[PDB]
Amino acid sequence: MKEIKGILESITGFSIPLDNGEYALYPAGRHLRGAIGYIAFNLDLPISSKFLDFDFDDIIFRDLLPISKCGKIFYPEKNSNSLKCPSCNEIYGSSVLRNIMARGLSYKEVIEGKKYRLSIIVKDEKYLNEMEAIIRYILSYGIYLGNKVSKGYGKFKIKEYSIVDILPVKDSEVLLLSDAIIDNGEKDIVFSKKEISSSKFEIIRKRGKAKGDIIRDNNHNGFGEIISL
Amino acid sequence: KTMKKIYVTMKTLSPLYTGEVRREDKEAAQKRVNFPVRKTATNKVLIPFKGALRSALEIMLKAKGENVCDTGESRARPCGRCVTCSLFGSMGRAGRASVDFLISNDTKEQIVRESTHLRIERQTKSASDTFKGEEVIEGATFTATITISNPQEKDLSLIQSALKFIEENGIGGWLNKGYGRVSFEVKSEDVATD
Amino acid sequence: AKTMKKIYVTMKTLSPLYTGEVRREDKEAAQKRVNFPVRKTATNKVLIPFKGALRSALEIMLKAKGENVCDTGESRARPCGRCVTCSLFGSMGRAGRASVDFLISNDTKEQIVRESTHLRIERQTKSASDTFKGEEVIEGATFTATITISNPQEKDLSLIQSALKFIEENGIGGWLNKGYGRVSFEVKSEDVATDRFLK
Ligand SMILES: [Zn+2]
Ligand SMILES: [Zn+2]
Ligand SMILES: [Zn+2]
Numbered sequence A: 001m002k003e004i005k006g007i008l009e010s011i012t013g014f015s016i017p018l019d020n021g022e023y024a025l026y027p028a029g030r031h032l033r034g035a036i037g038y039i040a041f042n043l044d045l046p047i048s049s050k051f052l053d054f055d056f057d058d059i060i061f062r063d064l065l066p067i068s069k070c071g072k073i074f075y076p077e078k079n080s081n082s083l084k085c086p087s088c089n090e091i092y093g094s095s096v097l098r099n100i101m102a103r104g105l106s107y108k109e110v111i112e113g114k115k116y117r118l119s120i121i122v123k124d125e126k127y128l129n130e131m132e133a134i135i136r137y138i139l140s141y142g143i144y145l146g147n148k149v150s151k152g153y154g155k156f157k158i159k160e161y162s163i164v165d166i167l168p169v170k171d172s173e174v175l176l177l178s179d180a181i182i183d184n185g186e187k188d189i190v191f192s193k194k195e196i197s198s199s200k201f202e203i204i205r206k207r208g209k210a211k212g213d214i215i216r217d218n219n220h221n222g223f224g225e226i227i228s229l
Numbered sequence B: 001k002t003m004k005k006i007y008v009t010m011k012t013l014s015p016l017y018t019g020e021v022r023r024e025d026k027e028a029a030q031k032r033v034n035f036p037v038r039k040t041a042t043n044k045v046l047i048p049f050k051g052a053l054r055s056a057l058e059i060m061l062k063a064k065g066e067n068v069c070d071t072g073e074s075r076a077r078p079c080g081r082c083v084t085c086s087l088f089g090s091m092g093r094a095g096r097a098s099v100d101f102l103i104s105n106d107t108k109e110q111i112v113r114e115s116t117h118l119r120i121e122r123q124t125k126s127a128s129d130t131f132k133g134e135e136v137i138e139g140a141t142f143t144a145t146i147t148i149s150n151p152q153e154k155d156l157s158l159i160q161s162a163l164k165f166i167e168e169n170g171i172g173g174w175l176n177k178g179y180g181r182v183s184f185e186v187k188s189e190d191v192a193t194d
Numbered sequence C: 001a002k003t004m005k006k007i008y009v010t011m012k013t014l015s016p017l018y019t020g021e022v023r024r025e026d027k028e029a030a031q032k033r034v035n036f037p038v039r040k041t042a043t044n045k046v047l048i049p050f051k052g053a054l055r056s057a058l059e060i061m062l063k064a065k066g067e068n069v070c071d072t073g074e075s076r077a078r079p080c081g082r083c084v085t086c087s088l089f090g091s092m093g094r095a096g097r098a099s100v101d102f103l104i105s106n107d108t109k110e111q112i113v114r115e116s117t118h119l120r121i122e123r124q125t126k127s128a129s130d131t132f133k134g135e136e137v138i139e140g141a142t143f144t145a146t147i148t149i150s151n152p153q154e155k156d157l158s159l160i161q162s163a164l165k166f167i168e169e170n171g172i173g174g175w176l177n178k179g180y181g182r183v184s185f186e187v188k189s190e191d192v193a194t195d196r197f198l199k
Helices: A029-042 A047-051 A125-140 B023-030 B050-064 B083-087 B156-169 C024-030 C051-065 C084-089 C156-169
Strands: A002-006 A097-102 A105-110 A118-122 A155-157 A173-176 A214-216 B003-012 B097-099 B112-120 B127-136 B141-148 B182-191 C003-013 C098-100 C103-105 C113-121 C128-137 C142-150 C183-193
Touching (some): A002 A125, A029 A125, B050 B097, B141 B156, B156 C142, C003 C156, C051 C156, C142 C156
Antiparallel strands (some): A002 A118, B003 B141, C003 C142, C113 C128
8 A cells, every 4th residue: 555645736726616606625536536537538548447437446536635834734624614734723714715707607716826735545556557657647737626627727736746655544533534425424425427438427416424523433444534633 | 549738838919918807806906906917826827718719710710611609609509510619618528628728937026017098088188087907018928738639630730720810819808909919839749658 | 701801000100209108117117217208018119009099080080070970088988889980999898890909119119219308498487497308209110000800891991091091190199289199101901811820
């Protein structure tokens, strides 16, 4: 097991809508998965076939959680929309969003300059050979996460491709960094599969668990995530 | 497989204006300038580039003879059959070209100036209304990177044709009064293996 | 529709020419030396607004005929959208057919811009009461612009030439009453296909 670390920053702003006209503050790992699968199909890579597999259970993408001037990731504030890093507060929040009115199109973005965590957890080392190639393409051109990729919104640039290994969590009690798939969890989560080869945009809805919640689970390996805490 | 990459550097030849889309930053700037220029929060100027390339190929190919889908119309909903919808987008499948914003190489303090624009009466020959609009100086180098996946043979030539149509009509806003005339320098690259 | 009328306009200055700098920072930098800087590029070439001069010329002349052109020059006055001037240069909700470029000089500011002393002389004493340095453009300075008419109509070119003949009589730019801005326009028009670049 290993992971590729990164201080992924935004060249142009990203627009990710949620339900209830909510715009997400930071970019999520689902968006990274959806973009990297387009990369692997576009470069005729084999893992693209696994990219259209939503339960491959290797190459799991952790959320692009924002990084602070404290050098640490903003830990998500428990049961709250905004985030707060363990060192100081520096609290992210909505102020970073801007209401956009552009040619009829009224939407929102999140501004550029803030840095976000790259963390691609990979299990199979055979997949790491293609993983080095896809992080090496982004290294040259960039990745686009958001809406209006063809208009140019969402351009991301890595500044630190680091393939440093890691180990899973220890405590059973873990904090939910990202929203987790837990049935009858009363926190509705929506994403989609596009399947551009065969069309049929999906808009898959679910009722998983929300982020910022301490939960005890001995059967935990750590799209939810496990914070060691 | 081999996706087509077009590095488009743009040099501003007459002052550029593109209005700012974000309401909060536009409201913040409205104090100093009635018309703020479109700016990033990294203090750099971004320009929309997809729509101008699209509308260039729309009017050129429409009057050429190849029937296309007039976008920017009353309804503006496009087909999935004509050439522009195979390049710059369709109501169903994604467009084959990803057109990045023309980000600037320089910063706000080095290219962006506030200016007195005017409205003069035709009998008293004196200024009736004055307003303060922001522009980008001439000789300012912007950059963008077009991404045409599934490359057809008439792709780079069509993009260059559209850029010539943009070099003569202009990019941005206030296009009829002389704002927006630029030059485009173009380089191309296919990428195969990484 | 299938054509565009491109009017290449080359204008020579028969008089000293002044158009003021609009840019706050450039004007503020120049007021350390000259109280009236001229409007230049960062390429260091003189820019003149051209669309508003043509529009003003055609509104005064077409209102002098008796045609129902509106006036887009008063405070709060809106374009009506039905005139020939509203068709040629624009309306609120209807983009103009003429893409009038800026009058960009052929030479640079060292060649054609001169810092000039202007005065205010007291009438009774016949002595200088105010002095101010201001930049002006020399005579014989050549400027080029292109007026690109989209959806070309019959009258347009002649209308543009008529508007140019107004600007040849009155002037373009600032200090027009003092003698500044007297110019001479030469027209070289060409009807061209709008699909010229597709090849
Ligand atoms: Zn902090
Ligand atoms: Zn179409
Ligand atoms: Zn009118």
